[PDB]
Paper text:
By hydrolyzing PET, the enzyme produces mono-(2-hydroxyethyl) terephthalic acid (MHET), TPA and bis-2(hydroxyethyl) TPA (BHET). The enzyme is named PET hydrolase (PETase) for its PET preference. PETase adopts the canonical ɑ/β-hydrolase fold, in which the strictly conserved catalytic triad S131-H208-D177, as predicted from sequence alignment with homologous enzymes that exhibit PET-hydrolytic activity, is found on the protein surface.
Indeed, S131A variant showed very low activity comparing to the wild-type protein. However, attempts to obtain complex structures using the S131A variant, which crystallized in a C2 unit cell, also failed. It appeared likely that the R103 side chain occupied the putative substrate-binding groove and prevented the substrate from entering.
Author numbering: 1 to 261
Write the structure that this text describes.
Protein backbone atom coordinates (compact mmCIF):
# COMPACT_ATOMS: atom_id res chain seq x y z
CA UNK A 1 0.00 0.00 0.00
CA UNK A 2 1.70 3.17 -1.13
CA UNK A 3 -0.37 5.29 1.26
CA UNK A 4 0.39 3.40 4.43
CA UNK A 5 2.24 5.40 7.05
CA UNK A 6 3.47 4.55 10.49
CA UNK A 7 3.63 1.29 12.43
CA UNK A 8 0.90 -1.23 13.01
CA UNK A 9 -1.53 0.36 15.45
CA UNK A 10 -2.82 -0.93 18.74
CA UNK A 11 -5.86 0.17 20.75
CA UNK A 12 -3.59 1.86 23.28
CA UNK A 13 -1.61 3.70 20.64
CA UNK A 14 -4.86 4.94 19.13
CA UNK A 15 -6.30 5.95 22.54
CA UNK A 16 -3.29 8.04 23.49
CA UNK A 17 -3.14 11.79 23.14
CA UNK A 18 -0.81 11.64 20.17
CA UNK A 19 0.39 9.29 17.53
CA UNK A 20 3.94 8.50 16.43
CA UNK A 21 4.69 11.59 14.34
CA UNK A 22 5.91 14.95 15.54
CA UNK A 23 3.43 17.76 14.77
CA UNK A 24 4.22 21.26 13.64
CA UNK A 25 1.65 23.98 13.05
CA UNK A 26 1.17 27.45 11.58
CA UNK A 27 -1.58 29.97 11.22
CA UNK A 28 -2.69 30.75 7.73
CA UNK A 29 -1.58 34.29 6.82
CA UNK A 30 -4.08 34.99 4.10
CA UNK A 31 -7.09 32.72 4.40
CA UNK A 32 -8.77 32.28 1.08
CA UNK A 33 -12.50 31.99 1.35
CA UNK A 34 -12.84 31.44 5.09
CA UNK A 35 -12.15 33.38 8.23
CA UNK A 36 -9.01 31.96 9.78
CA UNK A 37 -7.12 28.73 9.85
CA UNK A 38 -4.48 26.67 11.58
CA UNK A 39 -2.60 23.99 9.71
CA UNK A 40 -1.17 20.98 11.56
CA UNK A 41 1.26 18.65 9.87
CA UNK A 42 3.51 15.67 10.61
CA UNK A 43 7.26 15.75 10.20
CA UNK A 44 9.15 12.80 8.70
CA UNK A 45 5.97 11.08 7.66
CA UNK A 46 7.61 8.84 5.14
CA UNK A 47 5.62 10.07 2.22
CA UNK A 48 2.87 12.41 1.20
CA UNK A 49 -0.24 12.31 3.38
CA UNK A 50 -3.95 13.13 3.05
CA UNK A 51 -5.57 16.36 4.14
CA UNK A 52 -8.54 16.94 6.44
CA UNK A 53 -10.54 20.17 6.92
CA UNK A 54 -12.45 20.75 10.12
CA UNK A 55 -15.17 23.30 10.70
CA UNK A 56 -17.00 24.36 13.99
CA UNK A 57 -20.64 24.89 14.72
CA UNK A 58 -22.89 27.94 14.94
CA UNK A 59 -21.32 30.71 17.05
CA UNK A 60 -18.20 28.61 17.49
CA UNK A 61 -14.56 28.95 16.73
CA UNK A 62 -11.47 26.78 16.19
CA UNK A 63 -11.16 26.13 19.90
CA UNK A 64 -14.17 23.85 19.86
CA UNK A 65 -12.56 21.40 17.43
CA UNK A 66 -8.85 22.12 17.82
CA UNK A 67 -8.00 18.88 19.55
CA UNK A 68 -8.39 16.99 16.31
CA UNK A 69 -5.52 18.93 14.75
CA UNK A 70 -2.67 17.41 16.71
CA UNK A 71 -4.59 14.21 17.32
CA UNK A 72 -4.98 13.42 13.65
CA UNK A 73 -1.78 15.07 12.37
CA UNK A 74 0.32 13.00 14.76
CA UNK A 75 -0.92 9.90 13.01
CA UNK A 76 -0.03 11.13 9.53
CA UNK A 77 -2.35 13.76 8.13
CA UNK A 78 -2.29 17.43 7.28
CA UNK A 79 -5.17 18.99 9.17
CA UNK A 80 -6.68 22.44 8.79
CA UNK A 81 -9.01 23.79 11.47
CA UNK A 82 -10.96 26.89 10.53
CA UNK A 83 -12.95 29.82 11.74
CA UNK A 84 -15.73 30.72 9.38
CA UNK A 85 -16.16 34.15 7.75
CA UNK A 86 -18.98 34.74 10.15
CA UNK A 87 -19.80 32.82 13.34
CA UNK A 88 -23.41 32.89 12.08
CA UNK A 89 -22.77 31.12 8.80
CA UNK A 90 -25.22 28.30 8.00
CA UNK A 91 -24.37 24.72 6.87
CA UNK A 92 -24.10 25.35 3.16
CA UNK A 93 -21.71 28.26 3.71
CA UNK A 94 -19.73 26.13 6.17
CA UNK A 95 -19.41 23.45 3.49
CA UNK A 96 -18.15 26.00 0.96
CA UNK A 97 -15.60 27.27 3.46
CA UNK A 98 -14.48 23.77 4.42
CA UNK A 99 -13.81 23.08 0.74
CA UNK A 100 -11.99 26.41 0.43
CA UNK A 101 -9.76 25.29 3.35
CA UNK A 102 -8.94 22.02 1.57
CA UNK A 103 -8.28 24.10 -1.50
CA UNK A 104 -5.86 26.29 0.38
CA UNK A 105 -4.04 23.24 1.74
CA UNK A 106 -3.69 22.10 -1.85
CA UNK A 107 -2.44 25.57 -2.82
CA UNK A 108 0.14 25.51 -0.05
CA UNK A 109 1.21 22.02 -1.08
CA UNK A 110 2.04 23.31 -4.59
CA UNK A 111 3.62 26.60 -3.61
CA UNK A 112 7.40 26.49 -3.26
CA UNK A 113 7.45 29.01 -0.46
CA UNK A 114 5.18 27.16 1.94
CA UNK A 115 6.20 24.96 4.84
CA UNK A 116 4.06 22.18 3.57
CA UNK A 117 5.28 22.17 0.00
CA UNK A 118 5.06 18.61 -1.31
CA UNK A 119 3.66 17.12 1.87
CA UNK A 120 0.14 16.44 0.66
CA UNK A 121 -1.45 13.98 -1.64
CA UNK A 122 -4.20 16.27 -2.94
CA UNK A 123 -6.15 13.36 -4.31
CA UNK A 124 -6.81 12.13 -0.74
CA UNK A 125 -9.01 14.41 1.32
CA UNK A 126 -11.39 14.26 4.24
CA UNK A 127 -13.94 16.38 6.03
CA UNK A 128 -14.90 16.75 9.69
CA UNK A 129 -16.82 19.20 11.77
CA UNK A 130 -19.14 19.96 14.60
CA UNK A 131 -22.90 20.49 14.50
CA UNK A 132 -23.73 22.90 11.66
CA UNK A 133 -20.09 22.22 10.63
CA UNK A 134 -20.99 18.51 10.75
CA UNK A 135 -23.91 19.24 8.43
CA UNK A 136 -21.46 21.17 6.32
CA UNK A 137 -19.19 18.13 6.16
CA UNK A 138 -22.08 16.02 4.93
CA UNK A 139 -22.97 18.61 2.30
CA UNK A 140 -19.32 18.60 1.23
CA UNK A 141 -19.40 14.85 0.91
CA UNK A 142 -22.64 14.88 -1.02
CA UNK A 143 -21.34 17.42 -3.51
CA UNK A 144 -17.82 16.07 -3.78
CA UNK A 145 -17.87 12.28 -3.94
CA UNK A 146 -14.10 12.09 -4.51
CA UNK A 147 -13.59 12.88 -0.84
CA UNK A 148 -12.26 9.77 0.81
CA UNK A 149 -13.81 10.07 4.27
CA UNK A 150 -16.09 12.08 6.46
CA UNK A 151 -16.37 12.11 10.24
CA UNK A 152 -18.80 14.79 11.49
CA UNK A 153 -19.79 15.12 15.12
CA UNK A 154 -23.26 15.97 16.42
CA UNK A 155 -24.32 16.96 12.90
CA UNK A 156 -27.25 19.09 12.01
CA UNK A 157 -28.78 20.33 8.75
CA UNK A 158 -32.30 21.51 7.98
CA UNK A 159 -32.65 18.44 5.80
CA UNK A 160 -31.81 14.91 6.91
CA UNK A 161 -31.74 13.19 3.56
CA UNK A 162 -28.11 12.52 2.75
CA UNK A 163 -28.80 9.57 0.48
CA UNK A 164 -26.52 11.03 -2.13
CA UNK A 165 -23.45 10.49 0.01
CA UNK A 166 -21.13 7.80 -1.31
CA UNK A 167 -18.20 8.82 0.88
CA UNK A 168 -17.32 6.60 3.93
CA UNK A 169 -18.97 8.44 6.77
CA UNK A 170 -18.64 8.08 10.51
CA UNK A 171 -21.12 10.06 12.57
CA UNK A 172 -20.35 10.82 16.19
CA UNK A 173 -23.56 11.48 18.14
CA UNK A 174 -24.18 12.73 21.67
CA UNK A 175 -26.90 10.86 23.48
CA UNK A 176 -28.34 13.75 25.40
CA UNK A 177 -27.97 16.39 22.71
CA UNK A 178 -30.68 19.00 23.15
CA UNK A 179 -29.52 21.26 20.31
CA UNK A 180 -29.39 18.70 17.51
CA UNK A 181 -31.18 15.79 19.11
CA UNK A 182 -30.05 12.39 17.96
CA UNK A 183 -33.51 11.17 17.07
CA UNK A 184 -34.32 14.13 14.87
CA UNK A 185 -30.85 14.88 13.56
CA UNK A 186 -27.78 12.43 13.68
CA UNK A 187 -29.81 9.24 13.44
CA UNK A 188 -32.12 10.16 10.59
CA UNK A 189 -29.08 11.51 8.73
CA UNK A 190 -27.26 8.26 9.34
CA UNK A 191 -30.28 6.23 8.30
CA UNK A 192 -30.61 8.10 5.02
CA UNK A 193 -27.27 6.90 3.68
CA UNK A 194 -27.71 3.76 1.66
CA UNK A 195 -24.76 3.89 -0.69
CA UNK A 196 -21.70 3.98 1.48
CA UNK A 197 -19.56 2.54 4.18
CA UNK A 198 -20.95 4.22 7.30
CA UNK A 199 -20.89 4.21 11.05
CA UNK A 200 -22.75 5.76 13.98
CA UNK A 201 -21.20 6.07 17.44
CA UNK A 202 -23.30 7.57 20.21
CA UNK A 203 -21.64 8.81 23.35
CA UNK A 204 -23.38 7.87 26.60
CA UNK A 205 -24.80 10.86 28.37
CA UNK A 206 -23.26 13.30 25.96
CA UNK A 207 -24.34 16.87 25.55
CA UNK A 208 -24.04 18.64 22.18
CA UNK A 209 -20.38 19.39 22.91
CA UNK A 210 -19.42 15.79 23.79
CA UNK A 211 -16.84 15.46 21.00
CA UNK A 212 -15.32 18.89 21.42
CA UNK A 213 -11.95 19.91 22.76
CA UNK A 214 -11.49 19.01 26.39
CA UNK A 215 -14.06 16.24 26.32
CA UNK A 216 -13.86 13.24 28.60
CA UNK A 217 -14.01 10.60 25.84
CA UNK A 218 -11.03 11.46 23.72
CA UNK A 219 -9.52 8.04 24.04
CA UNK A 220 -12.46 6.45 22.28
CA UNK A 221 -13.52 9.29 20.01
CA UNK A 222 -9.97 9.94 18.89
CA UNK A 223 -9.27 6.26 18.30
CA UNK A 224 -12.35 5.98 16.10
CA UNK A 225 -11.70 9.20 14.18
CA UNK A 226 -8.10 8.33 13.44
CA UNK A 227 -9.00 4.74 12.55
CA UNK A 228 -11.74 5.82 10.15
CA UNK A 229 -9.49 8.32 8.41
CA UNK A 230 -6.60 5.87 8.19
CA UNK A 231 -8.78 3.12 6.83
CA UNK A 232 -10.54 5.24 4.23
CA UNK A 233 -8.12 7.97 3.35
CA UNK A 234 -5.05 5.76 3.23
CA UNK A 235 -6.87 2.51 2.25
CA UNK A 236 -5.00 1.10 5.24
CA UNK A 237 -6.49 -2.23 6.21
CA UNK A 238 -4.31 -2.45 9.27
CA UNK A 239 -7.01 -0.12 10.63
CA UNK A 240 -10.00 -2.11 9.44
CA UNK A 241 -10.42 -3.77 12.78
CA UNK A 242 -10.53 -0.44 14.61
CA UNK A 243 -12.65 1.29 11.98
CA UNK A 244 -15.27 -1.45 11.97
CA UNK A 245 -15.44 -2.56 15.56
CA UNK A 246 -18.39 -2.17 17.85
CA UNK A 247 -16.56 -1.04 20.95
CA UNK A 248 -17.31 -2.82 24.19
CA UNK A 249 -17.49 0.34 26.24
CA UNK A 250 -19.80 1.77 28.81
CA UNK A 251 -19.05 5.14 27.18
CA UNK A 252 -21.04 4.10 24.14
CA UNK A 253 -24.82 4.18 24.25
CA UNK A 254 -25.40 3.12 20.67
CA UNK A 255 -23.36 1.77 17.79
CA UNK A 256 -24.38 1.11 14.18
CA UNK A 257 -22.35 0.32 11.09
CA UNK A 258 -22.91 -0.74 7.50
CA UNK A 259 -20.76 -1.74 4.55
CA UNK A 260 -17.55 -1.51 6.57
CA UNK A 261 -14.43 -3.57 5.80
Amino acid sequence: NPYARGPNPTAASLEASAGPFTVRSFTVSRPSGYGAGTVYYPTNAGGTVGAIAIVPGYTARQSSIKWWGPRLASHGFVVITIDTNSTLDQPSSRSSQQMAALRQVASLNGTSSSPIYGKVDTARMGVMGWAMGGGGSLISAANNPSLKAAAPQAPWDSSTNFSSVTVPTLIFACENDSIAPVNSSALPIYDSMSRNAKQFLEINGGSHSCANSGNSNQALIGKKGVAWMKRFMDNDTRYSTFACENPNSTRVSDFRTANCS
